[PDB]
Amino acid sequence: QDVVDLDFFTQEPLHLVSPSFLSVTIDANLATDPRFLILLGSPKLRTLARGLSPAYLRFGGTKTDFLIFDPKKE
Amino acid sequence: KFKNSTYSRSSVDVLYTFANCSGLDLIFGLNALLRTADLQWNSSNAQLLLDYCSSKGYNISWELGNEPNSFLKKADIFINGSQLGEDFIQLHKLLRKSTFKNAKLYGPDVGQPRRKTAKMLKSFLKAGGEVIDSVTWHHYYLNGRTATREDFLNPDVLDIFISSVQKVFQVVESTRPGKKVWLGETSSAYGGGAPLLSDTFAAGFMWLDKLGLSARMGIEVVMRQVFFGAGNYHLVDENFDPLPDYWLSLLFKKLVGTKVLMASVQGSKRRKLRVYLHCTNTDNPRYKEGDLTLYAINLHNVTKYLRLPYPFSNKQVDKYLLRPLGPHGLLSKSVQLNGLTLKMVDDQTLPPLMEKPLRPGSSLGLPAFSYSFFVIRNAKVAACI
Numbered sequence A: 001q002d003v004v005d006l007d008f009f010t011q012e013p014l015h016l017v018s019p020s021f022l023s024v025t026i027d028a029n030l031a032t033d034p035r036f037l038i039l040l041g042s043p044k045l046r047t048l049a050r051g052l053s054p055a056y057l058r059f060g061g062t063k064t065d066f067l068i069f070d071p072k073k074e
Numbered sequence B: 001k002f003k004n005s006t007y008s009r010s011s012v013d014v015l016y017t018f019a020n021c022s023g024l025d026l027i028f029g030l031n032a033l034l035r036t037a038d039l040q041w042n043s044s045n046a047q048l049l050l051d052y053c054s055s056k057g058y059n060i061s062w063e064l065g066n067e068p069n070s071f072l073k074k075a076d077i078f079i080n081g082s083q084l085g086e087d088f089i090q091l092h093k094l095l096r097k098s099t100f101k102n103a104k105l106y107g108p109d110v111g112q113p114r115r116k117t118a119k120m121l122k123s124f125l126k127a128g129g130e131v132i133d134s135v136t137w138h139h140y141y142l143n144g145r146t147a148t149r150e151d152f153l154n155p156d157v158l159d160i161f162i163s164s165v166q167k168v169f170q171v172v173e174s175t176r177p178g179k180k181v182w183l184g185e186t187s188s189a190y191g192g193g194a195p196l197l198s199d200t201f202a203a204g205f206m207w208l209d210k211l212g213l214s215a216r217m218g219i220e221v222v223m224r225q226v227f228f229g230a231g232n233y234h235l236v237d238e239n240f241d242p243l244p245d246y247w248l249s250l251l252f253k254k255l256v257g258t259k260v261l262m263a264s265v266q267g268s269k270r271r272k273l274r275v276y277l278h279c280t281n282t283d284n285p286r287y288k289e290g291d292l293t294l295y296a297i298n299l300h301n302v303t304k305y306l307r308l309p310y311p312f313s314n315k316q317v318d319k320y321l322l323r324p325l326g327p328h329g330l331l332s333k334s335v336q337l338n339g340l341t342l343k344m345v346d347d348q349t350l351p352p353l354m355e356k357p358l359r360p361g362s363s364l365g366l367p368a369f370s371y372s373f374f375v376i377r378n379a380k381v382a383a384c385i
């Protein structure tokens, strides 16, 4: 036999997830890539990202604790 | 290993506009290894950055530190969880004395229990648990360097995750009950992912199972490492083509609502046939209140047929079955929905996602090494209303 019976619990919500349940990251290290600007500029990529709205985008990774803001910088 | 780098106001604007015009909620992780003599968090740098973000009207949320358990290994600097809690508070003050004083604060993005991470997380939640809006932790199943194809297909590997979560909820229930629990960064395999594994159809087993278990065990948000970048576990490769996890994520987002329910298999084995139940996602114009979304993983080497229980046995079911495009099977970087290859129509345009309606009363066909969504139309579950 390859026939399987399922049991469902449907009395009430067991949990409620965020609408942003399925969220994504960009690793902090992507901002050490010279081509950063071009990459996140990509319209195609934005079409793909918009498909996952609503979602958080977490900018972090190992490089988080090794990055320093330079407002003099270009 | 890792040394200090700067970034420009410019960098910031890229990342903000990316998220803004994409419709996502930027969370920005701040440098926590900026230290004062007494090993306090030196807040001045972040302060500069907030001024600029504030001075642009940037709607942004915040983190402080990533995987703080590693700092000793990483930067020959050990911060006890107590101090990190104290630093979180220093930052909450700075946010409160800012233009968006309602801005959310998440942390401490600790590694999974396996990394001997409990003591740090318990001490950090006792110390600074009051000022964070969610607890963030990270999870990977495997080492990317050693991970095999059979690891990706092994239910015993998937099952380790259950205990990971249990051990997290143990620390949190003992220090900040009712606090929302988030996976801050998670995928298949650490060190950037498993080459030729993390970017294929085969990666879908660990990704859809992680989503199922997280929803089921009370995880409120799951953050996929990464949407785009260097690592093999990217949803979108370096040529901006979507990988099969991306199509899986998109199908998940259209079909699965916020109300988590429960399905399980009658056998004394619920290991290789894994099943999840939510209310159908309301925002989807094809479906009405009461409708259920079942999602199923088949890790057996043959087709299994699923039978819906009373009183949903005779309902109309729409199949959304995902299978690799050949010839690389589970190692393929291309997937088919109900036997139709999934691709962008053009750079501006995603395809339709086309159901396959089943005859009412048919058992639910789930081929070997495959995952599927099944929408139960007119289920009329009151809890879903």
Ligand SMILES: *[C@@H]1O[C@H](CO)[C@@H](O)[C@H](O)[C@H]1NC(C)=O
Binding pocket: B035, B036, B037, B042, B044, B045
């Ligand atoms: C914090 O860092 C700044 C440079 O960013 C330095 O000039 C300052 O003296 C530091 N403050 C303390 C109290 O350690």
Ligand SMILES: *[C@@H]1O[C@H](CO)[C@@H](O)[C@H](O)[C@H]1NC(C)=O
Binding pocket: B301
């Ligand atoms: C399919 O899996 C079984 C275990 O259920 C394994 O022993 C078997 O070798 C596989 N198929 C065949 C034809 O042997």
Ligand SMILES: O=C(O)[C@H]1CNC[C@@H](O)[C@@H]1O
Binding pocket: A027, A060, A061, A062, A063, B067, B138, B185, B189, B190, B191, B192, B193, B231
């Ligand atoms: O090892 C990995 O893949 C990840 C582990 N957490 C930190 C990330 O920067 C890193 O990319």
